[PDB]
Amino acid sequence: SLFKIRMPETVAEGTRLALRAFSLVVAVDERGGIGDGRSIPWNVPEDMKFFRDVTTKLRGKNVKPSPAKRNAVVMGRKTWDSIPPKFRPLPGRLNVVLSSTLTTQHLLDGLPDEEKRNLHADSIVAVNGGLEQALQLLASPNYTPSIETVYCIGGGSVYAEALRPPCVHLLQAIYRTTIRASESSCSVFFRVPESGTEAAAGIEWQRETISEELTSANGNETKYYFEKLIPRNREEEQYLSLVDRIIREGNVKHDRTGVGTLSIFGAQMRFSLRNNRLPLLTTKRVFWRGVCEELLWFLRGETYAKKLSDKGVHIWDDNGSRAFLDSRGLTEYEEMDLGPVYGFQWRHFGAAYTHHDANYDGQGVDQIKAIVETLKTNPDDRRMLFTAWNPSALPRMALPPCHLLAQFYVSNGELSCMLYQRSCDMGLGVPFNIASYALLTILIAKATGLRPGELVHTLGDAHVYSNHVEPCNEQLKRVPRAFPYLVFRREREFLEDYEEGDMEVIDYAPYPPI
Amino acid sequence: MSLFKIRMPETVAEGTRLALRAFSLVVAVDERGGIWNVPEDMKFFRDVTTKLRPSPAKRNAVVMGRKTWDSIPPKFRPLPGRLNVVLSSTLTTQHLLDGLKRNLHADSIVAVNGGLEQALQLLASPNYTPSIETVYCIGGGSVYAEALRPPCVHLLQAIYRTTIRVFFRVPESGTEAAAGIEWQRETISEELTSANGNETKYYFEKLIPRNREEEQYLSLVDRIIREGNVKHDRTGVGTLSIFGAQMRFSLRNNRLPLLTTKRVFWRGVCEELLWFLRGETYAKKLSDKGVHIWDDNGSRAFLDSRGLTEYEEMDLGPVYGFQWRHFGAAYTHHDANYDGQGVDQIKAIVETLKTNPDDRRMLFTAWNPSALPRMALPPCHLLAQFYVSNGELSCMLYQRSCDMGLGVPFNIASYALLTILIAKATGLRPGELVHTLGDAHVYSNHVEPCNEQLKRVPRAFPYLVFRREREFLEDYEEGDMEVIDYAPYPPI
Numbered sequence A: 001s002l003f004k005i006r007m008p009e010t011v012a013e014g015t016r017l018a019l020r021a022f023s024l025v026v027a028v029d030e031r032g033g034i035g036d037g038r039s040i041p042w043n044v045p046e047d048m049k050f051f052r053d054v055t056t057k058l059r060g061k062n063v064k065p066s067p068a069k070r071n072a073v074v075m076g077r078k079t080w081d082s083i084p085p086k087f088r089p090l091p092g093r094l095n096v097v098l099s100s101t102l103t104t105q106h107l108l109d110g111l112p113d114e115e116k117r118n119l120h121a122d123s124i125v126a127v128n129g130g131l132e133q134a135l136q137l138l139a140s141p142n143y144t145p146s147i148e149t150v151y152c153i154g155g156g157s158v159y160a161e162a163l164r165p166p167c168v169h170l171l172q173a174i175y176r177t178t179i180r181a182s183e184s185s186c187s188v189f190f191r192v193p194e195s196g197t198e199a200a201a202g203i204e205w206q207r208e209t210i211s212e213e214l215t216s217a218n219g220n221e222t223k224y225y226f227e228k229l230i231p232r233n234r235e236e237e238q239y240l241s242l243v244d245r246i247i248r249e250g251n252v253k254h255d256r257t258g259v260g261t262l263s264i265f266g267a268q269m270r271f272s273l274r275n276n277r278l279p280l281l282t283t284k285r286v287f288w289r290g291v292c293e294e295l296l297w298f299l300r301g302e303t304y305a306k307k308l309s310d311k312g313v314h315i316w317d318d319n320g321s322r323a324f325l326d327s328r329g330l331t332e333y334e335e336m337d338l339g340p341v342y343g344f345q346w347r348h349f350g351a352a353y354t355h356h357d358a359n360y361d362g363q364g365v366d367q368i369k370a371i372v373e374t375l376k377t378n379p380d381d382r383r384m385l386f387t388a389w390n391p392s393a394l395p396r397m398a399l400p401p402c403h404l405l406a407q408f409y410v411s412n413g414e415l416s417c418m419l420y421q422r423s424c425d426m427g428l429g430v431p432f433n434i435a436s437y438a439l440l441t442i443l444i445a446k447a448t449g450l451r452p453g454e455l456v457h458t459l460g461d462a463h464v465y466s467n468h469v470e471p472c473n474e475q476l477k478r479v480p481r482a483f484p485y486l487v488f489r490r491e492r493e494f495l496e497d498y499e500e501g502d503m504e505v506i507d508y509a510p511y512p513p514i
Numbered sequence B: 001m002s003l004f005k006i007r008m009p010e011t012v013a014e015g016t017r018l019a020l021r022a023f024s025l026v027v028a029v030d031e032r033g034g035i036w037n038v039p040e041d042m043k044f045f046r047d048v049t050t051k052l053r054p055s056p057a058k059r060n061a062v063v064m065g066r067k068t069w070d071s072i073p074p075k076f077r078p079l080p081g082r083l084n085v086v087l088s089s090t091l092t093t094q095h096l097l098d099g100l101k102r103n104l105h106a107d108s109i110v111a112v113n114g115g116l117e118q119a120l121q122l123l124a125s126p127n128y129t130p131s132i133e134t135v136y137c138i139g140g141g142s143v144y145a146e147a148l149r150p151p152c153v154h155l156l157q158a159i160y161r162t163t164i165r166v167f168f169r170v171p172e173s174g175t176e177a178a179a180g181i182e183w184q185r186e187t188i189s190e191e192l193t194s195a196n197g198n199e200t201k202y203y204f205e206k207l208i209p210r211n212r213e214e215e216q217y218l219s220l221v222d223r224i225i226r227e228g229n230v231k232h233d234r235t236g237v238g239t240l241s242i243f244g245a246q247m248r249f250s251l252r253n254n255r256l257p258l259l260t261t262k263r264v265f266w267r268g269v270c271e272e273l274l275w276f277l278r279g280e281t282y283a284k285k286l287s288d289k290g291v292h293i294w295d296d297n298g299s300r301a302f303l304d305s306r307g308l309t310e311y312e313e314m315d316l317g318p319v320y321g322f323q324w325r326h327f328g329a330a331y332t333h334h335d336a337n338y339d340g341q342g343v344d345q346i347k348a349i350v351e352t353l354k355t356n357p358d359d360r361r362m363l364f365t366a367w368n369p370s371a372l373p374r375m376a377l378p379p380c381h382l383l384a385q386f387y388v389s390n391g392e393l394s395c396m397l398y399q400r401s402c403d404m405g406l407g408v409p410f411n412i413a414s415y416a417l418l419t420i421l422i423a424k425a426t427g428l429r430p431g432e433l434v435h436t437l438g439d440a441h442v443y444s445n446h447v448e449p450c451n452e453q454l455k456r457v458p459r460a461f462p463y464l465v466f467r468r469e470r471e472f473l474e475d476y477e478e479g480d481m482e483v484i485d486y487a488p489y490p491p492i
């Protein structure tokens, strides 16, 4: 306990979600109009179907909406009133209504009968505020992470709030149907701000998809099309442009097997960790549970990989086997005893390692505890770094450290981190390490009374394996989506006590397998 | 009588009405950025907020929270020479005055029942715009917080921060909190020592939002000087030039790209543009307004040097605006009646803009090879094309020959105005100006001054507001509009 890092009284502060991320669904005419102030002056059943499916369906396969896992739909009072009483609430979704007039009971009182009220009791909530207040409520443990995706559907006032800060920064996707008509009957309008405009607040909107022009079977042959707009993700673009550079200009190298590689030397990337943001790459899914479990394992100063494999994390299995250890001369280590790797050096630098069973408390230099104490007392210190690169210990490690050094910096109450990585597998390793040092920085922020800032990633030998070239090249076609967020469901007394189940990654919508 | 003019729609003032007025911020912080009697800071505070570039017709405004008003020791309040704007949900302007002396300071205080935004709405109204030169936010924590977030942050022209040795935080560039704004220091002072007890250490900072649009211009001036080809003209006048460039300028939200690193003669810009739109050719209509830009090209001597021997002084022939409104019409003299003569390109564009926004032929030219020999000067800005997106009107200007020092900033302003006026005539909001340059040059005599101007950090652009409207486009007068919050650098 004396050797552990005690979390400050402000643990959940500076990590708590202010607003839940959301997507937006809207239909417009070509003049950008949405309604007359009361209803919608066109009828395209095909769009009503799309609206239903996009807001109703969960991500993935064979899904079933439920009280424990469902989508939420946020609307204004006038939008609620525009739904015919028999068709409301919107089935299979949590209906969040914004209103200063009506309470949650008032909304139920507007339902035809008691049977409908008793049944749909759990599926209707009133918020006395705007969309921001709703996102604050949907950021609550009761709703986060039970609600998979929030959808704003909400009408001009709510749309306007959605497209302006602070809410627009939480907007992951705009699903926009355009009706080919110029309706004069429209009094309410909708517009998305353009790339370099003041109103865009630094967001660059671009289309992921646009459909062909379609014809409605509504009797009027009305033309319409679909668009999905997403906020340009320049941070993931860094990683993609590096991959592309490696393919096009990288030197051919061969590793310690004769396995071919394309590589460059010297690169740098940056990622915002502010306001719960988590740089998990979207163009290819990251094994977050592995990232999380292993980072905690590092932080504890652990060396027994069986603690990972017992948790279904098999990333170290091949490097912990009898055959592999033996091939490094480590004939005395039991299987899965990796030696004094990584987090052992973080917590116990220079300590004399023999086996994982030994008790290393207070042995070596605890670099992480030293950093935490410095951060809370003199955050402007320029020596706040730790290393796993220990030439004295290297020969007795299963693997020499890859991500080998990290340095901290503080500005405006924000903690930033620079990672140094000597050898960077772009296809699989790099996205994993970005997620890993994002988590670390967030946890150190919580341990020190600071808000998370930025992750800087310095790469040495950045490379793409021979068999990754073609997959990675097809991945380059994908337009990066908005990043997920990290949320803590509970806290701990000590940093070392944190569990993978204490936190949840929300609003992670990566592209399917290549 | 007015059948050949362009009638404005009912929605004239809608697309150019000022929602919020621009402002600057003054704050004193400790070494941790938090929130004590440094007289030099008080003198600075007074000088910045009080001084004009002061009367009930021409003064600065100061916006403050209620408790900041409370913390000003009575008799120092109201702050002299400034309109005092106090934000309060509890106190009216009568209440504030009751706390005071009275009578003569009635015209000096106003309570606003709301936040900074609501106060900026009020100051944007004709009563306080442009009668108030600069708005200063000095108000407490809650007011500063509102100042450094949208919508208000988009109207913040400068931050004057004294650091002396609730937290005041300027969002770092690239941050979501920054909202696309890049804050940077125009100036930072040496660490100064106060004259008092304790020998207090303190320094001044002036932070400004990076003007990347004016940087295009300065980046081009720089490239022309460092890399431009040398030419000496028919008179032996030296020039440095490059060929082919392009700049963009936003016109949204009343924004006016008047360059700040070197003052632009706005009044001349505006009078001349209106003169173009009217199809005018008699430059004496401008000189009789104190705009003398065409004098050296309208004189008998110059006219004769172009062999234009039958034109009376200041009659320039079928130049510019004549081609805009009467393309290909036969020109005799300026006083002749040209109604219905030639092709009215402006009116055709206006009608197309309202009926078929996506048309790709919405352009006009002054480049008329048939009429060039009869012009005092061939057109420099010779083609403009229009474009509509998201209810916004955009414009592309083509300029064959571009004097970077004096001509170019003038023409940016000129076509900025044009686009604003055409949007008003067509039911659209101003979008973007795109400016294509041909032979872009800096004169030998401008190299040194231009090089010094390059040291100056571009400031935030001013705004154009319309004080009154007109029934016809051609009826617009320079007095109908005002440029607000234009704070250019002094002479080179």
Ligand SMILES: NC(=O)c1ccc[n+]([C@@H]2O[C@H](COP(=O)([O-])OP(=O)(O)OC[C@H]3O[C@@H](n4cnc5c(N)ncnc54)[C@H](OP(=O)(O)O)[C@@H]3O)[C@@H](O)[C@H]2O)c1
Pocket (backbone or CB within 6 Å): A025, A026, A027, A028, A033, A034, A035, A036, A037, A038, A039, A040, A075, A076, A077, A078, A079, A080, A082, A098, A099, A100, A101, A102, A128, A129, A130, A131, A153, A154, A155, A156, A157, A158, A159, A188
């Ligand atoms: N084309 C489309 O895809 C689409 C989709 C949805 C809606 N619409 C149309 O949009 C029109 C309605 O839009 P609208 O903007 O006028 O109304 P609205 O957005 O639908 O609802 C506004 C109402 O929401 C409540 N509200 C919103 N913000 C609030 C806040 N900050 N604090 C407290 N309460 C708040 C207020 O309820 P109280 O009055 O009770 O205080 C307010 O009157 C209708 O014609 C509808 O058909 C179109």
Ligand SMILES: NC(=O)c1ccc[n+]([C@@H]2O[C@H](COP(=O)([O-])OP(=O)(O)OC[C@H]3O[C@@H](n4cnc5c(N)ncnc54)[C@H](OP(=O)(O)O)[C@@H]3O)[C@@H](O)[C@H]2O)c1
Pocket (backbone or CB within 6 Å): B026, B027, B028, B029, B035, B064, B065, B066, B067, B068, B069, B071, B087, B088, B089, B090, B091, B113, B114, B115, B116, B138, B139, B140, B141, B142, B143, B166
């Ligand atoms: N170091 C510096 O440069 C500096 C500059 C200014 C102030 N300060 C200090 O800070 C102290 C006060 O700071 P503060 O944080 O309390 O801010 P404040 O200046 O006192 O502003 C808060 C007050 O302004 C009014 N207000 C603000 N926003 C409003 C809105 N949205 N709608 C209606 N009313 C609104 C409210 O007045 P009502 O309660 O009457 O409704 C509110 O109580 C002062 O004592 C001063 O000494 C320091």
Ligand SMILES: O=c1ccn([C@H]2C[C@H](O)[C@@H](COP(=O)(O)O)O2)c(=O)[nH]1
Pocket (backbone or CB within 6 Å): A255, A256, A400, A402, A403, A423, A424, A425, A426, A428, A429, A430, A433
């Ligand atoms: O954390 C890690 C660990 C290994 N890698 C990859 C990078 C390299 O291709 C191999 C390590 O091989 P080595 O020869 O030890 O540098 O694994 C990674 O990208 N991130």
Ligand SMILES: O=c1ccn([C@H]2C[C@H](O)[C@@H](COP(=O)(O)O)O2)c(=O)[nH]1
Pocket (backbone or CB within 6 Å): B380, B381, B401, B402, B403, B404, B406, B407, B408, B411
């Ligand atoms: O609107 C204008 C008109 C003239 N200029 C400058 C550009 C050229 O240096 C001269 C015209 O001389 P010229 O030889 O016709 O290109 O004036 C300008 O920059 N903007």
